[PDB]
Amino acid sequence: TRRAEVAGGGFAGLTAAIALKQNGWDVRLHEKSSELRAFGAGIYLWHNGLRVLEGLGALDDVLQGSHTPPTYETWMHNKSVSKETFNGLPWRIMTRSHLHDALVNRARALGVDISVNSEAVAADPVGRLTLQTGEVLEADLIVGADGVGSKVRDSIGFKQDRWVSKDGLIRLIVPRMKKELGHGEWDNTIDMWNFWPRVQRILYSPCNENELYLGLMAPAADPRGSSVPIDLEVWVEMFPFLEPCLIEAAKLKTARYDKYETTKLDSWTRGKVALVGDAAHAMCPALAQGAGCAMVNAFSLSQDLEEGSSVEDALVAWETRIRPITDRCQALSGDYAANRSLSKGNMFTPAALEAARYDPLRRVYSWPQ
Ligand SMILES: Cc1cc2nc3c(=O)[nH]c(=O)nc-3n(C[C@H](O)[C@H](O)[C@H](O)COP(=O)(O)OP(=O)(O)OC[C@H]3O[C@@H](n4cnc5c(N)ncnc54)[C@H](O)[C@@H]3O)c2cc1C
């Protein structure tokens, strides 16, 4: 029986663990934190990621308690500039805890061995994983799913193109306060852009009937807009129609202003070691495909490992097959981010929706645009 060691309990790590377990691997997943949990408030999932969930046997628990807006609307200075529904292309909004729990319950039901307070500090291409305590573990496959700053990746050494965003945002989960919002289309996803009187943007995303996912974006150089707890006055001023929700957001003393970095590597494999998720391809958040590609890649890895070839050969075949979809998505997302293309509306074109249209289960592209 083949054994796999997965470093990282994030969406990519859980996806890989479950996919491998389903194919008969003995699997152990290592999470450095003392508890299994996800940060980031909310998250968007598209057709490609929803298919992975179906392939993992975790779709049902995710759909129940999640939300699909009637439309994805964009505003520029409070003027609606577009409403797109992606020609039937499936998508869903949910809190990260909701998605994380579905994956963790599924992993537990399958018998995946989860170790907390277990931090991987090094990986050997020959099939060895070293923990922070010094303990060395041997396996037939090592999966590096430890996010940005990946110690597994850095212990082997990959050529890396790195970039860091000077500006960030505050992501929060607050009550819907739907009735207090009054007249409007408050079940819609609404990306509210503003450049005047100042640069402030809010991504409004309902997760279900009780929770609302908000993304408050302001320049790092803005002392008021980027502060946490949020500076209520400055947000209500440019988004008065959301005052009821903003009032609730101002009470979250745990809010944080997060920035991000992007990563592109020369390769994702080395011997029996495979890198997945952020550790391998963190990207700009514009297309909301970070977790989507991560899960597709983690799931595809388990597929290529079922061809009867050696793990080393399976890994390079995996990257050759699946990598182009991620590279292209990462690049386009990079362009959108830099040029603030989403502020124009109608930007979810066929090209931008390429990764979302991919169906990892049948390995073909669906929902034509
Ligand atoms: C502002 C913003 C908005 C985004 N919105 C979306 C969206 O709407 N939809 C979408 O699909 N994607 C989105 N993304 C991208 C998405 O967040 C990531 O791609 C994905 O969640 C990360 O996958 P991961 O599991 O590989 O990373 P992680 O998320 O961090 O995986 C690593 C986990 O392993 C643990 N760990 C770290 N080091 C070690 C170690 N050495 N040993 C053991 N364990 C370790 C950590 O506790 C960590 O939780 C967004 C990103 C940003 C910055």
For the chain, list the domains and their CATH numbers. Answer: 1-38+96-165+261-369 (3.50.50.60), 39-95+166-260 (3.30.9.10)
Q: Report the separation in Å between the CA atom of 178 and the middle of ligand 1, taken as the mean of its atom positions.
A: 30
Q: What's the token pair of residue 323?
A: 């990598």
User: Which two three-digit tokens encode residue 221?
Assistant: 């150089």
Closest among 152, 120, 145 to 13, alpha carbons compared:
145
d(CA 84, CA 171): 23
Asked whether 260 lines ligand 1 (CB < 6 A), one says yes
**Separation between Cα atoms, residue 117 and residue 9, nearest integer Å:** 11
Indicate whether residue 275 lines ligand 1 (CB < 6 A). Answer: no
Q: Is the CB of 147 under 6 A from ligand 1?
A: yes
Nearest to 107 by CA among 154, 145, 137, 151: 145
Residue closest via CA to ligand 1's atom 4 equals 285
What is the b/e burial string over 135-151, where b = at least 16 CB atoms within 10 angstroms of the residue's CB? eebebbbbbbbbbeebb
The CA 44 to ligand 1 mean position distance, Å, reads 13
- The torsion angles phi and psi of 177, rounded to 5 degrees, stand at 50, 35
Asked if residues 90 and 66 have their Cβ atoms less than 8 Å apart, the reply is: no
Chain centroid, CA 62 distance in Å: 15
**Atom 7 of ligand 1, nearest CA residue:** 288
Q: Please check whether residue 30 is in contact with residue 119, taking contact to mean a CB–CB distance below 8 angstroms.
A: yes
Distance of CA 333 to CAs 89, 178, 288, 336, Å?
Answer: 19, 32, 9, 5
18 alpha carbon – ligand 1 mean position (Å): 17
C-alpha closest to that of 113 among 137, 149, 147: 137
**Does ligand 1 have an atom closer than 6 angstroms to the CB of 120?**
yes
Cα-to-centroid distance, 11 and ligand 1 (Å): 7
Q: Which of 188, 319, 198, 191 is nearest to 266 (CA)?
A: 319
Q: Token match 């990959």: residue?
A: 158
Smallest CA-to-CA distance from 62 within 251, 271, 270, 291 is with 291
Reported resolution, Å: 2.1
Determined by X-ray
Q: What tokens does 281 get?
A: 């391809």
Ligand 1: atom nearest CA of 215 is 1
